[PDB]
Design a protein around this ligand. Structure first.
Ligand SMILES: *P(=O)(O)OC[C@H]1O[C@@H](n2cnc3c(N)ncnc32)[C@H](O)[C@@H]1OP(=O)(O)OC[C@H]1O[C@@H](n2cnc3c(N)ncnc32)[C@H](O)[C@@H]1O
Ligand SMILES: *P(=O)(O)OC[C@H]1O[C@@H](n2cnc3c(N)ncnc32)[C@H](O)[C@@H]1OP(=O)(O)OC[C@H]1O[C@@H](n2cnc3c(N)ncnc32)[C@H](O)[C@@H]1O
Lengths: 143, 147
């Protein structure tokens, strides 16, 4: 496992969350009225989830050199206790959110993106902390 | 016929996205590079415009190409060969398929300097795309009515 590959993406997730947090108090009616605010939060959520999918793929490629869907990849990290199983279960559906936001499914419901903001702001800081704690362990073993 | 309705809805969306993108036509590079939020808005607008056009092109060519395959870049060039787009526009606008692939993260990392230039390219080219597809839409409706 290459720490800098993982840490670069974790830092990006943290940056994107920092920007997404600027939206955490916007009312739904103002959100639905502002296409540009929908665009910003949709792209932030896409970038966050795609960075996580990339992190998970890198980690699993070094451990289980088996193939997982993006949803299962979160679950598998839970089995390795790299994520907690509870976080892995909660956050795995953000893989479907990523697909939704690149138009792999049908239209985007802004009401559901609005609610997803608060769950991303809860779950992904924990994802970052858990992956960071794993990376730090690997680094402190090398030392 | 379902193809005209499909094209017309997507053209209406492209027109709306272009209206929002036009707000950024006069932004300076330094202003753009210093505002992550303006980068996000323009990146997603470009993603939505190009994806809608890719959808249109797929529906146009499925009627004309009897199962023959094509990439999203190639679809734009095929429209030029069919004189649905002018060849000049077709070759100018085909690389927007590569922009779209980068914006949905098929590969690579996003260079904001390239996205900055794509704002101008899209504001020049996609209004012409809309006009020319709209002219084809009329021909299609006439052909369906004539058959
Ligand atoms: P894709 O087909 O990957 O996602 C669709 C749906 O299936 C869920 N899923 C994928 N793979 C699995 C496995 N292996 N097990 C169980 N479930 C799986 C995936 O999590 C996704 O779930 P959804 O709850 O439909 O969506 C995830 C997430 O997206 C937001 N959401 C939902 N519907 C939306 C609309 N219409 N607009 C905008 N956002 C939407 C919610 O945040 C939801 O939790
Ligand atoms: P992807 O693999 O989709 O595209 C790669 C590259 O190849 C071009 N291409 C695809 N198919 C063909 C055919 N049949 N013939 C000739 N060329 C083809 C495709 O247009 C793309 O060109 P690029 O110049 O790499 O990119 C197109 C477009 O994207 C923006 N761009 C470029 N680099 C970017 C970064 N780093 N970030 C964000 N956007 C970027 C530019 O607007 C460029 O014009």
């Amino acid at each position: 496992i290459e720490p800098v590959i993982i840490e670069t993406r974790l830092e990006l997730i943290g940056r994107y969350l920092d920007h997404l947090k600027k939206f955490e108090n916007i009312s739904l009616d103002d959100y639905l009225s502002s296409f540009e605010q929908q665009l910003i939060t949709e792209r932030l959520l896409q970038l966050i989830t795609q960075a996580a999918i990339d992190i998970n793929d890198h980690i699993l490629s070094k451990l289980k050199s088996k193939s997982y869907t993006n949803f299962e990849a979160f679950i598998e990290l839970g089995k390795y206790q790299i994520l907690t199983p509870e976080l892995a279960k909660q956050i795995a559906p953000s893989s479907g959110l990523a697909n939704r936001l690149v138009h792999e499914y049908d239209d985007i419901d802004p009401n559901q993106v609005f609610m997803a903001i608060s769950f991303a702001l809860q779950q992904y800081p924990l994802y970052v902390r858990q992956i960071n704690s794993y990376l730090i362990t690997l680094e402190e073993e090398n030392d």
